[PDB]
Write a protein that binds this ligand. Structure first.
Ligand code: CLA
Ligand code: CLA
Ligand code: CLA
Ligand code: CLA
Ligand code: CLA
Ligand code: CLA
Ligand code: CLA
Ligand SMILES: CCCCCCCCCCCCCCCC(=O)OC[C@H](COP(=O)(O)OC[C@@H](O)CO)OC(=O)CCCCCCCCCCCCCCC
Ligand SMILES: CC1=C(/C=C/C(C)=C/C=C/C(C)=C/C=C/C=C(C)/C=C/C=C(C)/C=C/C2=C(C)CCCC2(C)C)C(C)(C)CCC1
Ligand SMILES: CC1=C(/C=C/C(C)=C/C=C/C(C)=C\C=C\C=C(C)\C=C\C=C(C)\C=C\C2=C(C)CCCC2(C)C)C(C)(C)CCC1
Ligand SMILES: CC1=C(C/C=C(\C)CCC[C@H](C)CCC[C@H](C)CCCC(C)C)C(=O)c2ccccc2C1=O
Ligand code: SF4
Ligand code: SF4
Lengths: 62, 74, 148, 80, 739, 161, 139
């Protein structure tokens, strides 16, 4: 279980920020798949900084 | 004409060697079946091979060009 | 010392051509730009203008850039074979000795000095048996420039 | 026709639909939640393959993909 | 009506800190490295971020002051280096023998071998800019007059630079001060062009003509009185052309015939120098002034009399063309780009007209015998002119994307050209293919005929003749025109059409450039290469908004790389990419014009004259039978005349040899950007960010590959720089040695 | 004498390059006025030539049949000043510029706006990294031993497999 | 329906439109009501004038209809554009709005065509689907 503000590492192998550190901005309090919103320092090639991940793709390195 | 014949073919054969290995990796390679062998380890540190090939390309070309431009100007 | 500088140009060519060829070999299955490059095949143009624009991204186009590099590497190789032997065969080894150390002697004393009797294959006073080569010389310039 | 497949990491952002120049895409309600949406491509025969729907998807490595298949007269974008 | 605003912009350094301050897209910080190139791309494009035409035009006005500053700064350096570091004083005593020179090179690592034996007791770089011949025609005899002019340009440079600060930060004019085109046309015609040619006509009479009358009598540059003595001492202006003793009473009483000795119509070349007669050019700009001052009283202002350009276009409409020119005035007083493109078209079209009128009618004394300068003066202004014509097709395309309004343009002359553009482009498409076959294929035929031992089947002068009869006739009506249809002129408009050989020193100043079978071929190569250059640029203009392929190409922009790989692939569809492709074709077109010029003159025109009168030219009349085949273009021009740019190592011409090979590099380096694409490098950089992220020091400004539009731009920039600077080095090292 | 290369003090082809370089400048001097300003710039050029032939004769270089000084990199200590000694002199200077820009970026990245400080360079932090850059052959030794010179591969981003 | 005949805008021009492809198979027509007599750019060349209308325009491509249908929603705010594709020498009537509403708006009763119940990193290798009729993205 990840909470907001927690510094996570992404295990989604397709992501631009795979195996990189980001801070969770929020989690969605419903049963929606991919609820974990992580904000990253580094922008991807579409110059965005957020994505929706699941709890299986993140860890709790804090 | 005989040296220049086979060397230009050898370049075309050596480029086509890496070309058909590259076709193997899209079509025929299966990373769930091929794991922990020599093949699935070279893919595992492929950034280490390209960047160290990015150095020796850039190490020679910075210097043997500058060694020529030195000898030109001088 | 002239043979020193060419072998490191050659070693630059074999390393760079390998660099392009093992780039698209190992990155044929995905990168941070296009992670699903195995879903699109070996030969496909691009993934559009999105994600910064992905021209020449495929594993086919890494072959395609290294064909310029092998022609240049064998071009470095066989220019060095030919001009070294053009002084060996003519008995004047000193022309490759002093002029090959700097790139103007490579230009003046190989491409300019030796292409004189070729380029007089057909002058306005006659023609020789080299006029099939002087034609195919210019024929080769025209087809090369058309690829541009 | 080019194949357009929409993956489940879509968020109902509606951005790829309004960036389509040939009106291929549309929004549809989702089964398991019945509140959020997803894009859908019921008119893939109209798809020219411009990949403008991938330039508008906000998810990291976009939820809608375009695979350039066989080229008909519509997908070639021919006025003749 | 002058209307301004008082202090709209403060003079602060708060925005000097932040780069990218002007736009909402920038100044947030570079998250990637494209921002470093996004900043330098859209700075001087004021129209994008600022959405007020009043604010946009104030930026444009005060910026030309900054460009006026850098020209004056550059002009002072032309005058300072002629004052300090030149042999201008020794050159006036012997102008044929001594080579013109400035730019002494410092005694460091070996570049003091470039300070060569250039003439007299001076050592420096033999320059090819013609400033020595321009300052002699201006009358300058000592270096003090050059030194004060270098100071005079720097105070003028500060004057323009202060005026750009003042007219944006302090007193910026409103929009209505800029939209007054009739008062602007009135002022620039009579004031800038008329008084500028009236006041320069004053210099050529009082200053240039007296000192040159003694210089062509050949006394000394020291014995000649200073040019203020020709204003003060009226006895001194009476011993040479004694019509100054009557004052301005021939002028006001219309008895202008008394000025028949310093306002002539002699019209030839000076037999002592080989330049135009200065009394012709004195009479010239005086006649140009009155035509320009009178024409500046044409357009209407706040005094009722005068033409209105809005009502000349209304009721200039025919039955073919619908609503006529109705709307082109309102387009031209609102679009800054349509004003830019048209003023760029006829600035670059003029710059080639300047080149053609200056080798054949050499305006300056000892410019014609200076073959080292007359070729570089031709090849410069041709090259300057072709860049500006590509900027015409560029900025006409930027007009179409955001300044074109369909509501203002219904059935006018912009609408009706955008409605039959498929008829314009395809008929332009055919006439290139017709000209490419029937001009280049006549070289391919002549290659194949001379290769196969069939010299009687090619197109030559001793073969199937293609004589240029429409140009040889015009050579006849202009060589026999002095005395019959221009009866007051003593000699012809030029010696290029027909006339004697003017021989100044031992060398030809000018001689009749004949036209033959080869000249038919190259002038149709020129007709072909221009028509393709038009075809790429005009396709970019007419299809800048839409096509059958992309119907919303103006919604995507003037400068975007592609609409994707769909519709078969839509790479290089935008209006910017046609400007990018036309740059090579402009490079392709102009480089043949300069190859045509450099060998036409060396074989048929330029050369030496013996003591009897026979001419021996430079390359020895080999343009007639050599320049009809591509092999003769390779063997007798590019191989035979680059024998001075490569045998120049170890001599004073060595920096031409180094610029030769050094520009072959940058040309060939450009193909790395042109032939390849971006998405290779963006995954190659992903291996280099890894090898920097491994040692924990990867930069926070994330490295990106150059964009698709930038990679095209950085490849065309090094392409032109690589080939022009090769042609720069080949031309300079050749004609300095033989001419 | 390592590859048939005679030393340049007894190499006659090298001593003949001097005879033709000054003869190509004395004939360049023979036409000018003797007290003039281009005359003294050629004698400054003639004597600059004599200061490179006497500099290469006494340095013990190896001249071939052409008469030009050849360099010998296998590194021998009798020929150590060709590549080994300026190569060591190179490697400290390049590693100084290398470790300075690496120490600058690690300090800047743990701040509020890291990308801002790459554009406008903080002269405190820039001159700090010069102080941390002069000690780099010592500083990298305890940096590599501490484990914080490199990163493990679970911390770097990496393309999909 | 298409309501042909409907008045063409007052145009008279455009080489660039509706050539021989239209008479054999598949041309398109966009129909709208323009609430003025104002000028608008065509995808062919630029002007016509929109009628009071019932305005109709026969275009060559569907891509040219949505480009014009975007201009009427942008510049004139007339979003009532209703494109078609013709009969016997054409294919399919009533192309847009396909379900009585714009595709960016949600409408129940639509079915998710081309949906995938997986991510893109969960796509199989092509070697697993080699020598089969399955493709590496279809489900
Ligand atoms: C014996 C070795 C060998 C074999 C069996 C193959 C076989 C194959 N290759 Mg490989 N390849 C080879 C060597 C080989 N290649 C070499 C030496 C290179 C480097 C040059 C390559 C680089 C390569 C690439 C990049 C690709 C292949 C592909 C293929 C596959 C399809 C080829 C095809 O249909 O193209 C059709 C054939 C042509 C279009 C031939 C035209 C090109 C020639 C060179 C034109 C010659 C110019 C002209 C005639 C000269 C005139 C003279 C002048 C004086 C006028 C097939 C499996 C493709 C594939 O997808 O694999 C699954 C593919 O993308 N090959
Ligand atoms: C004058 C011509 C020229 C020059 C100097 C270069 C120089 C270079 N090329 Mg380029 N290249 C060229 C033409 C040229 N290229 C052309 C015409 C193509 C075909 C499009 C390429 C395609 C190419 C590729 C694919 C790569 C290079 C790379 C390089 C770099 C190699 C490292 C080194 O030598 O130092 C070097 C900057 C390599 C590189 O930058 O790796 C870091 C690399 O991967 N070049
Ligand atoms: C000297 C005092 C001074 C000061 C403090 C300012 C301050 C300002 N000016 Mg002003 N201005 C000045 C004089 C001054 N100006 C002058 C002399 C001119 C006439 C050129 C102008 C005309 C002007 C315009 C049109 C605009 C400004 C603007 C500005 C504001 C932002 C500019 C900026 O931050 O970029 C600083 C820019 C630079 C440091 C680059 C200067 C480039 C110079 C002029 C030419 C360099 C080319 C040179 C020849 C190099 C060739 C290549 C080289 C390799 C050889 C800032 C308040 C902008 C503004 O107010 O936006 C709302 C704006 O649009 N100024
Ligand atoms: C048009 C622009 C321009 C250019 C390209 C040059 C170029 C040159 N100048 Mg000139 N100069 C110019 C304008 C220019 N100048 C103007 C407007 C003045 C009056 C202010 C001068 C006054 C001047 C003097 C007094 C000297 C030069 C010198 C030089 C040469 C050496 C460069 C140097 O010393 O920089 C130095 C680097 C910096 C200043 C960077 C800080 C170089 C050819 C020198 C020379 O030719 O020696 C023989 C020299 O002594 N210049
Ligand atoms: C007879 C008086 C007079 C004179 C001598 C000039 C002269 C000039 N003006 Mg003009 N100008 C004038 C009246 C005049 N103007 C009036 C009355 C208006 C407003 C209706 C303008 C509006 C104007 C603009 C917008 C610009 C000029 C510019 C110029 C310069 C052209 C560049 C060149 O060739 O050098 C030149 C100095 C150009 C310039 O260099 O601006 C700094 C320019 O951009 N003028
Ligand atoms: C437009 C620039 C210009 C200027 C500033 C002058 C200025 C002058 N002229 Mg000149 N002149 C000019 C053009 C000019 N002229 C032209 C275009 C002609 C041919 C029509 C002449 C033909 C002329 C003659 C014949 C004489 C002058 C003379 C003079 C001087 C006294 C006249 C006076 O100011 O009352 C004065 C320096 C008088 C003088 O002093 O000459 C030494 C004189 O005798 N002028
Ligand atoms: C030297 C290389 C080269 C050649 C031959 C061409 C040729 C052409 N370009 Mg291309 N172009 C080039 C470089 C070249 N370009 C480069 C480097 C670029 C990138 C900037 C471009 C970008 C470009 C643009 C943007 C455009 C062109 C266009 C054209 C065509 C002009 C129409 C014409 O007059 O054809 C005449 C044909 C010739 C001069 C070829 C000579 C061949 C002889 C006469 C006939 C052949 C002999 C024989 C019959 C062969 C058949 C026998 C065989 C089958 C057995 C022509 C095909 C334009 C176009 O297509 O508009 C119509 C156009 O708009 N090109
Ligand atoms: C060419 C002579 C020519 O320009 O005729 C003039 C004619 C225009 O005649 P009008 O008197 O209708 O023109 C009124 C305006 O064009 C200018 O006043 O041009 C056209 O019809 C278009 C020409 C197409 C060009 C065909 C090639
Ligand atoms: C001198 C001498 C010697 C030595 C020799 C040696 C030892 C050699 C080696 C050699 C070698 C060392 C070689 C190698 C080569 C290699 C190559 C040729 C490579 C290539 C590769 C490739 C091309 C790959 C590809 C691929 C990929 C990429 C992926 C997957 C698939 C494949 C695998 C296909 C001796 C002892 C005898 C004695 C004395 C003399
Ligand atoms: C002596 C000699 C020689 C030899 C040499 C050799 C052979 C070497 C090798 C070496 C090697 C084989 C090495 C490699 C290495 C490896 C690695 C692994 C590396 C690493 C590195 C790093 C990691 C980096 C760091 C840094 C620095 C150091 C500085 C700056 C900063 C930086 C961070 C960049 C010769 C004969 C030539 C010559 C004579 C002398
Ligand atoms: C080589 C190449 C690149 C790679 C080139 C890049 C990334 C440019 C980077 C090179 C410059 C020189 C980096 C400059 C870095 C610093 C500014 C250096 C500062 C040094 C100071 C001392 C001045 C592309 O991105 C590309 C894209 C599209 C088509 C072709 C190409 C292409 O050919
Ligand atoms: S484009 Fe992709 S991310 Fe955006 S709404 Fe459509 S499916 Fe979702
Ligand atoms: S430039 Fe990029 S988007 Fe355009 S066609 Fe090429 S690969 Fe596709």
């Amino acid at each position: 279980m990840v909470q907001r503000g927690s510094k996570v590492r992404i295990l989604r192998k397709e992501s631009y920020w795979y195996q990189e550190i980001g801070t969770v901005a929020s989690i969605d309090q419903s049963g929606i798949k991919y609820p974990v919103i992580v904000r990253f320092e580094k922008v991807n090639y579409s110059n965005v900084n957020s994505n929706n991940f699941s709890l299986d793709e993140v860890v709790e390195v804090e | 004409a005989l040296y220049t014949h086979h060397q230009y073919i050898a370049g075309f054969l050596m480029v086509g060697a890496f070309a058909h290995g590259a076709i193997f990796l899209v079509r025929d390679y299966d990373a769930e079946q091929n794991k922990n062998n020599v093949l699935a380890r070279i893919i595992d540190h492929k950034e280490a091979i390209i960047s160290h090939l990015s150095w020796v390309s850039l190490f020679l070309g910075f210097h043997t060009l500058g060694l020529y431009v030195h000898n030109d100007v001088v | 010392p002239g043979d020193f500088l060419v072998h490191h140009a050659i070693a630059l060519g074999l390393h760079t051509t390998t660099l392009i060829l093992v780039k698209g070999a190992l990155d044929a299955r995905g990168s941070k730009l296009m992670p699903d490059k195995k879903d699109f095949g070996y030969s496909f143009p691009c993934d559009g203008p999105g994600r910064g624009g992905t021209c020449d991204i495929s594993a086919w186009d890494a072959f395609y850039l290294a064909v310029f590099w092998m022609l240049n590497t064998i071009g470095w190789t066989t220019f060095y074979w030919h001009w070294k032997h053009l002084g060996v065969w003519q008995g004047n080894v000193a022309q490759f000795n002093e002029s090959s150390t700097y790139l103007m002697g490579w230009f003046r004393d190989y491409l300019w000095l030796n292409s004189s009797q070729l380029i007089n294959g057909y002058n306005p006073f006659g023609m020789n048996n080299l006029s099939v080569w002087a034609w195919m010389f210019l024929f080769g310039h025209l087809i090369w420039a058309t690829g541009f | 026709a080019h194949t357009v497949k929409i993956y489940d990491t879509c968020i109902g952002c509606t951005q790829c639909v309004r960036a389509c120049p040939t009106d291929v895409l549309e929004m549809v309600p989702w089964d398991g939640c019945r509140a959020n949406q997803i894009a859908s491509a019921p008119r893939t025969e109209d798809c020219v393959g411009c990949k403008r729907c991938e330039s508008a998807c906000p998810t990291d490595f976009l939820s809608i993909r375009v695979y350039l298949g066989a080229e008909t007269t519509r997908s070639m974008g021919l006025g003749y | 009506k002058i209307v301004i605003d008082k202090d709209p912009v403060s003079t602060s350094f708060d925005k000097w800190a932040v780069p990218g301050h002007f736009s909402r897209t920038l100044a947030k910080g570079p998250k990637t490295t494209t921002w470093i190139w996004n900043l330098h791309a859209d700075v001087h494009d004021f129209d994008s971020y600022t959405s007020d035409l009043e604010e946009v035009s104030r930026k444009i006005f005060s910026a030309h002051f900054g460009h006026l500053a850098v020209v004056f700064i550059w002009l002072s350096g032309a005058y300072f280096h002629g004052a300090r570091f030149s042999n201008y004083e020794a050159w006036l005593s012997n102008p044929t023998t001594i080579k013109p020179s400035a730019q002494v090179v410092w005694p460091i690592v070996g570049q003091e071998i470039l300070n060569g034996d250039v003439g007299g007791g001076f050592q420096g770089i033999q320059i090819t800019s013609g400033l020595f011949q321009m300052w002699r025609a201006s009358g300058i005899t000592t270096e003090l007059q050059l030194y004060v002019t270098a100071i005079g340009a720097l105070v003028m440079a500060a004057l323009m630079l202060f005026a750009g600060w003042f007219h944006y930060h302090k007193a910026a004019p409103k929009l209505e001060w800029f939209q007054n085109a009739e008062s602007m046309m009135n002022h620039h015609l009579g004031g800038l062009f008329g008084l500028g040619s009236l006041s320069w006509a004053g210099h050529q009479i009082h200053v240039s003509l007296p000192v040159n009358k003694l210089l062509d009598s050949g006394v000394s540059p020291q014995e000649i009185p200073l040019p203020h003595e020709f204003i003060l001492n009226k006895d001194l202006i009476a011993q040479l052309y004694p019509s100054f003793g009557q004052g301005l009473t021939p002028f006001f009483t219309l008895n202008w015939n008394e000025y028949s000795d310093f306002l002539t119509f002699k019209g030839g070349l000076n037999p002592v120098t080989g330049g135009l007669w200065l009394s012709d050019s004195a009479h010239h700009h005086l006649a140009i002034a009155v035509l320009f001052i009178v024409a500046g009283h044409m357009y209407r202002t706040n005094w009722g009399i005068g033409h209105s350009m809005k009502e000349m276009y209304d009721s200039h409409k025919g039955p073919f063309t619908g609503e006529g020119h109705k709307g082109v005035y309102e387009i031209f007083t609102n679009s800054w780009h349509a004003q830019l493109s048209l003023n760029l078209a006829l600035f670059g079209s003029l710059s080639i007209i300047v080149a053609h009128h200056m080798y054949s009618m050499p305006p300056y004394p000892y410019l014609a015998t200076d073959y080292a300068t007359s070729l570089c003066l031709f090849t410069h202004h041709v090259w300057i002119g072709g860049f500006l014509i590509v900027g015409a097709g560029a900025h006409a395309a930027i007009f179409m994307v955001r300044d074109y309004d369909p509501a203002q343009n219904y059935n006018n002359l912009v609408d009706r050209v955008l409605r039959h553009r498929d008829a314009i482009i395809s008929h332009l498409n055919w006439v290139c293919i017709f000209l490419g076959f029937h001009s280049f294929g006549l070289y391919i035929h002549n290659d194949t005929m001379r290769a196969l031992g069939r010299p009687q089947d090619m197109f030559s002068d001793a073969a199937i003749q293609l004589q240029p009869v429409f140009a040889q006739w015009v050579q006849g009506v202009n060589s026999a025109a002095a005395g019959n249809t221009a009866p007051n002129a003593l000699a012809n408009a030029s010696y290029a059409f027909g006339g004697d050989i003017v021989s100044v020193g031992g060398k030809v100043a000018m001689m009749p450039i004949s036209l033959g079978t080869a000249d038919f071929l190259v002038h149709h190569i020129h007709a072909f290469t221009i028509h393709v250059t038009v075809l790429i640029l005009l396709k970019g203009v007419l299809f800048a908004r839409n096509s059958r392929l992309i119907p919303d190409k103006a919604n995507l922009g003037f400068r975007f790389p592609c609409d994707g790989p769909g519709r078969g692939g839509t790479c290089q569809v935008s209006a910017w990419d046609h400007v990018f492709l036309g740059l090579f074709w402009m490079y392709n077109s102009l480089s043949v014009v300069l190859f045509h010029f450099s060998w036409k003159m060396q074989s048929d025109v330029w050369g030496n004259v013996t003591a009897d009168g026979a001419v021996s030219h430079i390359t020895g009349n080999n343009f007639a039978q050599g320049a009809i085949t591509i092999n003769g273009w390779l063997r007798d021009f590019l191989w035979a005349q680059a024998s001075q740019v490569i045998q120049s190592y170890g001599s004073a011409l060595s920096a031409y040899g180094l610029m030769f090979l050094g520009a072959h590099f940058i040309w060939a380096f450009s193909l790395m950007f042109l032939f390849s694409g971006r998405g290779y490098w963006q995954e190659l950089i992903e291996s280099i960010v890894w090898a920097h992220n491994k040692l924990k020091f990867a930069p926070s400004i994330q490295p990106r590959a150059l964009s698709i539009t930038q990679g095209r731009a950085v490849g065309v920039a090094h392409y032109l720089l690589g080939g022009i600077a090769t042609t720069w080095s080949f031309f300079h090292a050749r004609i300095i040695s033989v001419g | 004498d390592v590859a048939g290369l005679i030393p340049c003090s007894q190499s006659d082809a090298f001593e003949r390059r001097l005879k033709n370089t000054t003869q190509r400048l004395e004939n360049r001097l023979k036409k000018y006025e003797p007290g003039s300003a281009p005359a003294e710039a050629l004698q400054k050029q003639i004597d600059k030539t004599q200061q490179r032939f006497d500099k290469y004769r006494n340095s013990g270089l190896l001249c071939g049949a052409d008469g030009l000084p050849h360099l010998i990199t296998d590194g021998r200590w009798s020929h150590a000043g060709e590549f080994t000694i300026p190569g060591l002199l190179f490697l400290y200077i390049a590693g100084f510029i290398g470790w300075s820009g690496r120490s600058y970026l690690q300090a800047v990245a743990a701040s509020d706006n890291s990308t801002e400080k790459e554009i406008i360079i903080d002269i405190p932090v820039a001159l700090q990294s010069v102080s941390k850059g002069f000690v780099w052959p010592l500083a990298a030794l305890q940096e590599f031993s501490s484990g914080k010179l490199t990163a493990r591969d679970e911390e770097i981003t990496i393309s999909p497999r | 329906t298409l309501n042909l005949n409907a008045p063409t805008p007052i145009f008279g021009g455009s080489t660039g439109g509706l050539l021989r492809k239209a008479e054999v198979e598949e041309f398109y027509s966009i129909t709208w009501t323009g609430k003025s007599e104002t000028v608008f750019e065509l995808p062919t060349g630029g002007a016509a004038i929109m009628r009071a209308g019932e305005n109709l325009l026969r275009l060559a491509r569907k891509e040219q209809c949505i480009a014009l249908g975007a201009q009427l929603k942008d510049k004139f705010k007339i979003t009532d554009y209703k494109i078609y594709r013709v009969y016997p020498s054409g294919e399919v009537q009533f192309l847009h709005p396909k379900d009585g509403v714009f595709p960016e708006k949600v409408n129940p009763g639509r079915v998710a065509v081309g949906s995938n119940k997986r991510r893109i990193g969960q796509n199989p290798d092509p070697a697993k689907l080699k020598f089969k009729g399955q493709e590496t993205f279809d489900s």
